[PDB]
Amino acid sequence: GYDRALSIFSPDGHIFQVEYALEAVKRGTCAVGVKGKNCVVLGCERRSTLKLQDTRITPSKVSKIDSHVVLSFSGLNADSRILIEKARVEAQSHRLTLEDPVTVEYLTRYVAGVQQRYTQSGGVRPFGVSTLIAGFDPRDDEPKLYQTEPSGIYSSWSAQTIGRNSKTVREFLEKNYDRKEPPATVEECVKLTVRSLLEVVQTGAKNIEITVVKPDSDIVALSSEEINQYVTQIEQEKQEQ
Amino acid sequence: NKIETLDPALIRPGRIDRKILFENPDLSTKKKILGIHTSKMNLSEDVNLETLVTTKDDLSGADIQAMCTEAGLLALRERRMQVTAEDFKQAKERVMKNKVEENLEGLY
Amino acid sequence: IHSRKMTTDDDINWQELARSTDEFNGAQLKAVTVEAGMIALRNGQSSVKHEDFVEGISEVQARKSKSVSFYA
Amino acid sequence: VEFSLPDLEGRANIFRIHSKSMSVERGIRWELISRLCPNSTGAELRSVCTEAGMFAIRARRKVATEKDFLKAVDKVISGYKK
Amino acid sequence: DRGVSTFSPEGRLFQVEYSLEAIKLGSTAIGIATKEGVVLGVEKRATSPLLESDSIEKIVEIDRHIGCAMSGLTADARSMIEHARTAAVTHNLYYDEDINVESLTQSVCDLALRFGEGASGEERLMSRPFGVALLIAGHDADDGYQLFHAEPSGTFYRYNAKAIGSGSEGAQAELLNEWHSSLTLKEAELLVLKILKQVMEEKLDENNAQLSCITKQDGFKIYDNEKTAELIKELKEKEAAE
Amino acid sequence: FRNNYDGDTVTFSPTGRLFQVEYALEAIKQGSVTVGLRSNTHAVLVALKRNADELSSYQKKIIKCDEHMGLSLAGLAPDARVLSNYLRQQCNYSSLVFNRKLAVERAGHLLCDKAQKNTQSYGGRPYGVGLLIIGYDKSGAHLLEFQPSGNVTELYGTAIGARSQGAKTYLERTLDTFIKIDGNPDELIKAGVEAISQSLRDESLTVDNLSIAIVGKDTPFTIYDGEAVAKYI
Amino acid sequence: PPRIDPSVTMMTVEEKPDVTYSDVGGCKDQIEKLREVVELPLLSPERFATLGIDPPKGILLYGPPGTGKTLCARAVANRTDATFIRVIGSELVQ
Amino acid sequence: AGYDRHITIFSPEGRLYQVEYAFKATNQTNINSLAVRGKDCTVVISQKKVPDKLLDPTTVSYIFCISRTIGMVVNGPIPDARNAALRAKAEAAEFRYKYGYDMPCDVLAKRMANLSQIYTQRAYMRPLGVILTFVSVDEELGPSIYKTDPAGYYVGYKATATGPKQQEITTNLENHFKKSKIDHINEESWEKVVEFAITHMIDALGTEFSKNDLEVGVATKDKFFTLSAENIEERLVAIAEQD
Amino acid sequence: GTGYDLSNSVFSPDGRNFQVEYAVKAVENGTTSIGIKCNDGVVFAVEKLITSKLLVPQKNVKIQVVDRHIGCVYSGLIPDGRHLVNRGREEAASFKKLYKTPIPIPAFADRLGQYVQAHTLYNSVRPFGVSTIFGGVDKNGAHLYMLEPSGSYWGYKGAATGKGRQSAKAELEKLVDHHPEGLSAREAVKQAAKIIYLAHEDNKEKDFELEISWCSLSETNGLHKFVKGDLLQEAIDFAQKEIN
């Protein structure tokens, strides 16, 4: 029985553990994402310093909770992995009793609800990772992308990016994307994802992972050569002037 | 460099409202610092200022001056008055690795 | 003693003003005479009424100060 | 006499006095301007009026409109870093 | 450093005084309780233009005749809503009756004391109380429409017009001369929307502004972006002249 | 010294007193004021209700834990319900197993047991609130003044909160008056009005600012509100 | 003494300042405290001789500088038409 | 910072400061007691201080009774003494519950050794400010003395001592045993052993005491008791004759 | 390195707990209490601080009781002294549960002693800052013990603690030489009232109330009773004449 409290109230009215937990997200691996009318795309990166990574033994940064539901995170890897297992166990329980596949709205409030407990319970450290929950709903083609935060507050975002140099890359997603006219083509959502990752990490042929989510329980994982094709088309057309 | 040690009465708020931070130099500013040192420094026709600034740690004015300084020592040890393009690339990696590399890799 | 320097009608009752306060030293009781003496000047009165001393005591000082909130 | 930081009601009349000298749009509200800035020393409020007639020039406005005070107050808040 | 059980020399707690600061740094929930109903409204305060107003909801529904809002930090609000609906929905099981709004407020305030270092008035512990301010409304068959305020300290009062969050000093200052005894549903919806536009930083729209109404026969209702925009244009036409 | 000796309520002081125990008394003085009186039969609790705005209501300061027994709180409002809920459980336990009304003397013994445990073990804190408890049994009326430090004393009548010494002035000189009044609930209420009137430095008590509760042998515990107290104003 | 330096004009002497409400508006508590000990004796001092007491020998003003602490003395001196003499501590140190 | 003298942790010098301060609390009462062994029996004598005239000499005892055989001698405050007294009487009873015969002498010293370690090893328990001394007659080795310190250590002793003056009492006991080349004292009757311990006690101290200023424990074979006020007075009169 | 008084388990360099020494100071700030140990019984006496005339006599009594055969009195904080008696009363029924016999004085002495010594070991709990004085009559006789906040108690022919214990201990020692054999229960009440008035010199700022209770064999037959009737009236007038 470890009873020692952690979360307190700062003189300004905030929590010290919550403030420093969000700093680990901005200092972690940056991950972008977008969603169109019929599709949603979640991009990632890989450290270019020392790369021995083999494609088979490298764990994917975007976890798959359900056939039509995907889960990505930018932040602490190990603290997120515990919630990834609990999300898949809850997906089994939600499909068991209720006989319904887990949705994005239910998974968001669950992860935000679990993270909320560790913040309000003395003796456990709150998580320092902010997960990005995406995917579709049963018999629904509308993409649901909800931003889960370590504090427990969640919202919906069409284009959201958290990680290093986040304030700079978010300015590109506002000009290159509109709320009233989202791209209806699954290929256009991939091009908008690459354009956001070219301003952070140079090169990045095999260092970028892009996951495409399709309706009717279909997920197409782009290989290393398939992602490089979209990189060449954008870089050659960016240099026209 | 630090305004915390200055006299707050000497600041006289409302007379001076302008506090300008420091911004990192772009590709254009870095070529200006190189043009001063590489002017007298011997360089072949394969030495271009755009290649050196392409891959860089975004060094300040002190490390950029030290980059061309280390490149001159490679020619002195080999007893040659003409510095090739390999010395600028070799000296660029040494100064880049003396500032930030892995940032003590971590954060799970 | 502080009421001797103040010019009044000599209606001050020492029993009523003593129980109206809580633990005031010799320096704090002197400030009550100064505050209550200037209250009558706001209404244009030269002398100081005995109820003006209560107004200085009923004024909020040294205990709750200007903070009234939370429990009540 | 003890001095304290002025609240939303305390700063409501402060910005209205300083705006009387300058010529701005009278259809604005100074109670919202004082709400954007938290509790701060009154000496720092004078620097806000000096920044009101500046950003308005960038917008090609000889007078300070309602949107001019939005970017002017948000500029001095991040400068204090408190 | 400093424990949660340390009392201030004025008879208060340090952690409780700092918990109220997070309320004034959040959003503003404005509501007014009238005889014909209760009108509630909030501002979502979207920083980035890419934020959608569909996911964020500051006004939930505990019961058909009972509803509440939230302001300040919205993280700790989702926990109390689960416990508030627990003593509410199950009240139809135990007593088979609509739970009193005042009785529901007492259950919310009793769950804000769960903090502390774990002396036992209760079994399981809690790190810190909820830093959210809950404005609780509702209607019953006895006293009529009731509007309370759930504070993290546990004190609660019945307010006819209550604006929590950052609009505590700004909105309540105008409620003195703009509120009186006899009120209608049309005057209540326009007075809340007019104050909501004045307390908001940017221009008010149908997204960040979401209103609500409390009715006896129909119950708790939510106006969408289309119905909210109807009151926006109607307010500008009536306020254009004088 | 000062904050150096406080890690908790457990740590002592060179003066033989606990600072954290004394801090609970400050919450009673700056809160609401409550006045009560009794002689041989009935009891009249005069309590005041404050608020944070003129458009708000007045929170009830009188908790009813029994038909023949009641109390009044001056202090923290939500923290007083914790002690009353335990009192309500003891009344139901005494009316079920023992099938006997809980006496006022034995009620105060169970109330002080909660605050003493929080001032003993580490991590606990006492919840400062004033308690004036009344009631009637086969002996007579009993008014026990309860303190958050565990102190309890039976008195004819007393007052706590702001201007507590002002209301005790009337009860001291009239102590030989109201004790001879038995079976007259009207004069017992009028005596409490004159005691609280001298302690008011703010304004007069309206219909919603005056809460009067009375309990007795033939008359049960009733909470007067609205125009019920207008006859004594 | 060889102490005479004709620098004594370094201070700022403003007779009957025209500034009434600048930083003073919005703060009620600071106004009422300076009305009894300044405005009244500078207007009708004869009532204080009958009152029996004397004004305080000093007024302690503590708080953040430049917030209107100095302008508060100029506001109360407007109705009484009093000469405002300010001694700056920065120029006072020599 | 100062956590070395607050809670028990490994110090840069390798010493536990919190436990060492408990030894200095043993000398607060200033009680010097020695334990000697006869042939078939063992006799222990402890000092008794009565500062207040209102004290009851029958209630005040520095030597308790664990059972009909094994005794206990404690030097220090009574609250820390009863902590080890309740466990010693319980563990002696728990032995015959799971076994059924009498606990030996060295067993009780080991049972109380691990318990005194719990105070030293665990930070939330403070070490006792008393020293345990157990004397009895073993069914095999005969007379034996086991003195359990608050440190949790126990070893066989010929004749031990405690208190601030233990250095002077030990010196007297060393010169006596080296001449006889035996650990204990050889005597038939147990009454003469009481006079033997008093002789070495007076020469080490240098002062005399009354019947109420001393407490003489006597552990015989398969029997244990404590001399009353009239029995201790008889020992002081009997030793007055001859030597 | 200071901070030895911030915990109960931390020992001072001299080997004396500071929290134990601070508990004695709390006794000197409370109402004093005395006691008399007779042959066939024991006598307890304690005064009360009178704030005003609102206090109703013979209602709130600081003298506790254990079953019918044992009385108890404490000097110190109110909640600390009353909670310790509740632990002894609940455990007294457990003794009659298993052993069927009424609990004697020596069995009740170690009953309260194990709790006080337990709070000094655990730093997370606060020890009792009150001095408990209990006594009664058992099969072997009548005994009077005085418990201390440090958990130290022994036999006492008289018990004096609190603020006025300095002048109270002098009178208890004189009664031993004046009556080496024993003392009657009726005379002990009159003698205990004079000791209370002797310590009243520091209490002269307010009024006083005397509460005396005793339990004996040949009179109460092992029953805790309070002094009332003409026995209390004659005891007050006897001590007031000797004190002045």
PDB file of C-alpha atoms in Angstrom, chain F residues 78-206:
ATOM      1  CA  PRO F  78     -19.898  20.619   3.886  1.00  0.00           C
ATOM      2  CA  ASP F  79     -17.584  19.353   6.634  1.00  0.00           C
ATOM      3  CA  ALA F  80     -20.342  19.544   9.261  1.00  0.00           C
ATOM      4  CA  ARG F  81     -22.414  16.965   7.360  1.00  0.00           C
ATOM      5  CA  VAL F  82     -19.698  14.348   7.937  1.00  0.00           C
ATOM      6  CA  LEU F  83     -20.220  14.486  11.706  1.00  0.00           C
ATOM      7  CA  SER F  84     -24.012  14.643  11.357  1.00  0.00           C
ATOM      8  CA  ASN F  85     -24.163  11.582   9.092  1.00  0.00           C
ATOM      9  CA  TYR F  86     -22.378   9.562  11.776  1.00  0.00           C
ATOM     10  CA  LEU F  87     -24.825  10.966  14.335  1.00  0.00           C
ATOM     11  CA  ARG F  88     -27.757   9.918  12.139  1.00  0.00           C
ATOM     12  CA  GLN F  89     -26.294   6.405  11.939  1.00  0.00           C
ATOM     13  CA  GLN F  90     -25.966   6.248  15.732  1.00  0.00           C
ATOM     14  CA  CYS F  91     -29.578   7.385  16.154  1.00  0.00           C
ATOM     15  CA  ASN F  92     -30.782   4.651  13.794  1.00  0.00           C
ATOM     16  CA  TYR F  93     -28.495   2.142  15.524  1.00  0.00           C
ATOM     17  CA  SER F  94     -29.808   3.164  18.952  1.00  0.00           C
ATOM     18  CA  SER F  95     -33.424   3.096  17.725  1.00  0.00           C
ATOM     19  CA  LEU F  96     -33.046  -0.378  16.158  1.00  0.00           C
ATOM     20  CA  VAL F  97     -30.811  -2.558  18.363  1.00  0.00           C
ATOM     21  CA  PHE F  98     -31.422  -0.655  21.603  1.00  0.00           C
ATOM     22  CA  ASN F  99     -34.720   0.907  20.416  1.00  0.00           C
ATOM     23  CA  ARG F 100     -33.770   3.894  22.580  1.00  0.00           C
ATOM     24  CA  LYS F 101     -33.407   7.593  21.829  1.00  0.00           C
ATOM     25  CA  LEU F 102     -29.772   8.691  21.908  1.00  0.00           C
ATOM     26  CA  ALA F 103     -29.099  10.942  24.888  1.00  0.00           C
ATOM     27  CA  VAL F 104     -27.465  14.333  24.415  1.00  0.00           C
ATOM     28  CA  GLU F 105     -24.677  13.522  26.880  1.00  0.00           C
ATOM     29  CA  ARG F 106     -23.800  10.278  25.082  1.00  0.00           C
ATOM     30  CA  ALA F 107     -24.137  11.950  21.670  1.00  0.00           C
ATOM     31  CA  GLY F 108     -21.312  14.409  22.341  1.00  0.00           C
ATOM     32  CA  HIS F 109     -18.996  11.572  23.369  1.00  0.00           C
ATOM     33  CA  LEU F 110     -19.313   9.953  19.935  1.00  0.00           C
ATOM     34  CA  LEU F 111     -18.880  13.250  18.061  1.00  0.00           C
ATOM     35  CA  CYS F 112     -15.538  14.158  19.657  1.00  0.00           C
ATOM     36  CA  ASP F 113     -14.148  10.701  18.818  1.00  0.00           C
ATOM     37  CA  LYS F 114     -13.885  11.605  15.120  1.00  0.00           C
ATOM     38  CA  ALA F 115     -11.808  14.775  15.518  1.00  0.00           C
ATOM     39  CA  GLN F 116      -9.423  13.256  18.074  1.00  0.00           C
ATOM     40  CA  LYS F 117      -8.448  10.479  15.652  1.00  0.00           C
ATOM     41  CA  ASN F 118      -7.603  12.995  12.913  1.00  0.00           C
ATOM     42  CA  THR F 119      -5.402  14.971  15.335  1.00  0.00           C
ATOM     43  CA  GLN F 120      -3.550  11.792  16.387  1.00  0.00           C
ATOM     44  CA  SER F 121      -2.515   9.692  13.381  1.00  0.00           C
ATOM     45  CA  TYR F 122      -0.412  11.243  10.632  1.00  0.00           C
ATOM     46  CA  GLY F 123      -2.237  12.349   7.498  1.00  0.00           C
ATOM     47  CA  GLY F 124      -5.480  13.262   9.248  1.00  0.00           C
ATOM     48  CA  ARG F 125      -6.836  16.738   9.882  1.00  0.00           C
ATOM     49  CA  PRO F 126      -9.800  17.912  11.970  1.00  0.00           C
ATOM     50  CA  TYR F 127     -12.624  19.649  10.128  1.00  0.00           C
ATOM     51  CA  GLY F 128     -13.256  22.897  11.978  1.00  0.00           C
ATOM     52  CA  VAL F 129     -16.953  23.548  12.577  1.00  0.00           C
ATOM     53  CA  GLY F 130     -19.004  24.766  15.517  1.00  0.00           C
ATOM     54  CA  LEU F 131     -21.742  22.584  16.994  1.00  0.00           C
ATOM     55  CA  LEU F 132     -24.518  23.675  19.340  1.00  0.00           C
ATOM     56  CA  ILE F 133     -26.595  20.550  19.996  1.00  0.00           C
ATOM     57  CA  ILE F 134     -29.932  20.488  21.821  1.00  0.00           C
ATOM     58  CA  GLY F 135     -32.533  17.903  22.750  1.00  0.00           C
ATOM     59  CA  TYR F 136     -34.898  16.618  25.395  1.00  0.00           C
ATOM     60  CA  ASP F 137     -35.098  13.438  27.469  1.00  0.00           C
ATOM     61  CA  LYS F 138     -36.785  12.234  30.659  1.00  0.00           C
ATOM     62  CA  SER F 139     -34.410  14.505  32.639  1.00  0.00           C
ATOM     63  CA  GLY F 140     -34.428  17.843  30.835  1.00  0.00           C
ATOM     64  CA  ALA F 141     -32.990  19.971  28.071  1.00  0.00           C
ATOM     65  CA  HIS F 142     -29.254  19.646  27.406  1.00  0.00           C
ATOM     66  CA  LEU F 143     -27.229  22.135  25.344  1.00  0.00           C
ATOM     67  CA  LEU F 144     -23.626  21.006  24.826  1.00  0.00           C
ATOM     68  CA  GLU F 145     -21.191  23.373  23.111  1.00  0.00           C
ATOM     69  CA  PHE F 146     -18.884  21.316  20.886  1.00  0.00           C
ATOM     70  CA  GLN F 147     -15.452  22.374  19.630  1.00  0.00           C
ATOM     71  CA  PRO F 148     -13.363  20.930  16.769  1.00  0.00           C
ATOM     72  CA  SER F 149     -10.561  20.246  19.275  1.00  0.00           C
ATOM     73  CA  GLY F 150     -12.760  17.763  21.163  1.00  0.00           C
ATOM     74  CA  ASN F 151     -13.921  20.111  23.929  1.00  0.00           C
ATOM     75  CA  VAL F 152     -17.567  19.782  24.981  1.00  0.00           C
ATOM     76  CA  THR F 153     -19.375  21.481  27.862  1.00  0.00           C
ATOM     77  CA  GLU F 154     -23.032  21.632  28.894  1.00  0.00           C
ATOM     78  CA  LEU F 155     -24.322  25.189  29.280  1.00  0.00           C
ATOM     79  CA  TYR F 156     -27.590  27.063  29.595  1.00  0.00           C
ATOM     80  CA  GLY F 157     -26.743  28.993  26.439  1.00  0.00           C
ATOM     81  CA  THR F 158     -23.826  30.461  24.543  1.00  0.00           C
ATOM     82  CA  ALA F 159     -22.804  31.966  21.213  1.00  0.00           C
ATOM     83  CA  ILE F 160     -19.952  31.313  18.781  1.00  0.00           C
ATOM     84  CA  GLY F 161     -18.659  33.133  15.732  1.00  0.00           C
ATOM     85  CA  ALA F 162     -18.341  36.830  15.039  1.00  0.00           C
ATOM     86  CA  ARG F 163     -19.293  39.074  17.973  1.00  0.00           C
ATOM     87  CA  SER F 164     -19.599  36.099  20.313  1.00  0.00           C
ATOM     88  CA  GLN F 165     -18.964  38.306  23.356  1.00  0.00           C
ATOM     89  CA  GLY F 166     -21.846  40.593  22.384  1.00  0.00           C
ATOM     90  CA  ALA F 167     -24.481  37.866  22.651  1.00  0.00           C
ATOM     91  CA  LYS F 168     -22.983  36.503  25.882  1.00  0.00           C
ATOM     92  CA  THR F 169     -23.647  39.879  27.530  1.00  0.00           C
ATOM     93  CA  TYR F 170     -27.422  39.380  27.421  1.00  0.00           C
ATOM     94  CA  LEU F 171     -27.209  35.754  28.573  1.00  0.00           C
ATOM     95  CA  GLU F 172     -24.981  36.636  31.543  1.00  0.00           C
ATOM     96  CA  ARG F 173     -27.257  39.210  33.191  1.00  0.00           C
ATOM     97  CA  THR F 174     -30.498  37.441  32.200  1.00  0.00           C
ATOM     98  CA  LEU F 175     -29.158  34.016  33.245  1.00  0.00           C
ATOM     99  CA  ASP F 176     -31.527  34.092  36.239  1.00  0.00           C
ATOM    100  CA  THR F 177     -34.502  35.081  34.037  1.00  0.00           C
ATOM    101  CA  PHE F 178     -35.091  32.541  31.251  1.00  0.00           C
ATOM    102  CA  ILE F 179     -34.213  29.588  33.510  1.00  0.00           C
ATOM    103  CA  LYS F 180     -37.525  30.105  35.342  1.00  0.00           C
ATOM    104  CA  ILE F 181     -39.583  29.980  32.115  1.00  0.00           C
ATOM    105  CA  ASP F 182     -40.892  26.467  31.426  1.00  0.00           C
ATOM    106  CA  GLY F 183     -43.535  25.425  28.919  1.00  0.00           C
ATOM    107  CA  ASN F 184     -43.614  28.857  27.222  1.00  0.00           C
ATOM    108  CA  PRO F 185     -42.016  28.514  23.763  1.00  0.00           C
ATOM    109  CA  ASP F 186     -42.868  32.116  22.832  1.00  0.00           C
ATOM    110  CA  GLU F 187     -40.759  33.789  25.525  1.00  0.00           C
ATOM    111  CA  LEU F 188     -37.861  31.404  24.869  1.00  0.00           C
ATOM    112  CA  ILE F 189     -37.717  32.567  21.243  1.00  0.00           C
ATOM    113  CA  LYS F 190     -38.023  36.259  22.139  1.00  0.00           C
ATOM    114  CA  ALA F 191     -35.062  35.940  24.515  1.00  0.00           C
ATOM    115  CA  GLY F 192     -32.875  34.668  21.672  1.00  0.00           C
ATOM    116  CA  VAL F 193     -33.842  37.585  19.431  1.00  0.00           C
ATOM    117  CA  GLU F 194     -32.695  40.196  21.957  1.00  0.00           C
ATOM    118  CA  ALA F 195     -29.408  38.324  22.460  1.00  0.00           C
ATOM    119  CA  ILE F 196     -28.482  38.201  18.764  1.00  0.00           C
ATOM    120  CA  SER F 197     -29.664  41.772  18.101  1.00  0.00           C
ATOM    121  CA  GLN F 198     -26.893  43.293  20.229  1.00  0.00           C
ATOM    122  CA  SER F 199     -24.229  41.297  18.348  1.00  0.00           C
ATOM    123  CA  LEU F 200     -25.229  42.531  14.863  1.00  0.00           C
ATOM    124  CA  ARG F 201     -22.810  45.133  13.491  1.00  0.00           C
ATOM    125  CA  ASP F 202     -23.988  44.708   9.885  1.00  0.00           C
ATOM    126  CA  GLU F 203     -27.760  44.954   9.391  1.00  0.00           C
ATOM    127  CA  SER F 204     -31.109  43.726  10.683  1.00  0.00           C
ATOM    128  CA  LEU F 205     -32.231  40.129  10.246  1.00  0.00           C
ATOM    129  CA  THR F 206     -34.817  39.614   7.507  1.00  0.00           C
TER     130      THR F 206
END
